Amino acid sequence: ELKLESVVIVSRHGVRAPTKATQLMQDVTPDAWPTWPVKLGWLTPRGGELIAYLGHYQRQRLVADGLLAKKGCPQSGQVAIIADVDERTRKTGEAFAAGLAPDCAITVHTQADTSSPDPLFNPLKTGVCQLDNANVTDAILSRAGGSIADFTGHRQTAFRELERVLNFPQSNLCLKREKQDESCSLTQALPSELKVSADNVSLTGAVSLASMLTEIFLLQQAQGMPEPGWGRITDSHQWNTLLSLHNAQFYLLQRTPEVARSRATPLLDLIKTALTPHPPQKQAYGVTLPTSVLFIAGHAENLANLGGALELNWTLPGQPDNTPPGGELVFERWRRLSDNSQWIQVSLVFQTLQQMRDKTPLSLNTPPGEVKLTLAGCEERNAQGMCSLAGFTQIVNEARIPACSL
């Protein structure tokens, strides 16, 4: 009924070491954090291998869909790869290429200067545009339930789960509060406030600490470390409860449209240029678009920003992190044969946490998880839930912030 014409994959980088080692991380547990085999924030070898499995799976699926050849290397830019300048994203691009097309030496493009941020992955970071402080503050606080106190008050079960995994009551932070007649709870020992600036939004205290620590436990599990969370995380309900704190911070700071639309605008422009039929032309990064397959190696925020800007909602069965390492927002252009009309499908492809833990080789018979998505604002949908090309174009033009374009 339908023929696949084009695919754009926006991928988070693979498993990485923690990006920071702070004094507060030491003070909230009596135990020693496991050390990692690469520098802070770098991709691990295992993370690269997990990405290559997704590349291998995507080759098999795209061959089955008739888009790539079963044997040989894709020719003349049929496949293009763009990565953010960070080590972890560059090496994710290389790992994906190695799985998709081994020995084909597909180039991993970055911006010219790899020592400075690339605004494609967040235009606020180079000051292309700025957030509206009052609008962002009100929008985030409303999505939090009206205040950060309301937000943390409704999540005490998850904070107590994190405290148990940390053995928080025996930590230096708690032992000093016991000596000062103040009771030991993460949220009250580390009050959380929303900080909004022209170029960033963040949360302080327990909310951001919890978001980072629960991601570290997940990374430990995916890395195959023997005892993530000191062996105190023993079932799936516990994993889901812990990562709810991480996903909740992303819901506030990255999915909120008042942030997401600006942060996602350059990626929206690149996705639309890649998916829209037009005479091929070398554009950004020296990549010729449109082409058959474009893989973009970025960050968790990019997945969440695109989700918030485009009203794409999901949770990932079997994967506690809704923006997991190697997770892929996959945009596809399909041609309907009955009338040769053009349609856009979006899905979230991801390894389950168990597939990461077991280093499961992926294939058509053992596929990654996949969640089919719908653009909530699309008014022209086909029977398969895809948006018409014109409908998707209108949604993108409405969502994007022109001042944030490159």
Residue numbers in the entry: 5 to 410
Excerpt from the paper describing this PDB structure:
AppA, the Escherichia coli periplasmic phytase of clade 2 of the histidine phosphatase (HP2) family, has been well-characterized and successfully engineered for use as an animal feed supplement. The E. Coli periplasmic phytase, AppA, is a 1D-6-phytase (EC 3.1.3.2) and initial hydrolysis preferentially liberates the phosphate at the 1D-6-position on the inositol ring. HP2Ps catalyse the hydrolysis of phytate via an obligatory phosphohistidine intermediate. The catalytic proton donor is found in a second, short, conserved motif with sequence HD positioned such that the aspartic acid residue functions as the consensus proton donor in the catalytic mechanism.
Notably, KM was 5-fold lower than wild type for the proton donor-less AppA-HAT variant and the MINPP-like AppA-HAE double mutant. The low turnover numbers (kcat) for these hydrolysis-compromised variants (only ~0.1% of that seen for the wild-type enzyme) suggests that breakdown of the phosphohistidine intermediate is rate limiting. Of the remaining variants, AppA-HAE showed a marginally increased production of InsP5 [1/3-OH] (22% of the total InsP5), while AppA-HET proved to be more catalytically flexible producing almost equal amounts of InsP5 [1/3-OH] and InsP5 [4/6-OH]. At residue position 305, the T305E substitution found in the AppA-HDE and -HAE variants results in sidechain χ1 angles of 46° and 65°, respectively, for the glutamate residue. The residue therefore adopts the g− conformation rather than the preferred g+ conformation for glutamate observed in α-helical environments, which is seen in bacterial MINPPs for which crystal structures are available. The g+ rotamer is required for the carboxyl group of this residue to approach the phosphomonoester bridging oxygen in the specificity pocket A to allow it to function as a proton donor in catalysis. Thus, in the AppA-HAE and -HDE variants the E305 sidechain points away from the substrate and towards the active site cavity. The inability of E305 to participate in catalysis is reflected in the similarity of the kinetic parameters for AppA-HAE to those of the proton donor-less AppA-HAT variant and low turnover number for hydrolysis of phytate. AppA-HDE has slightly enlarged pockets A and B due to the loss of the side-chain methyl group of T305, whereas the double mutant AppA-HAE has larger pockets A and B with an overall change in polarity. For both variants, pocket F decreases in size and its polarity increases by virtue of introduction of the larger sidechain of and carboxyl group of glutamate.
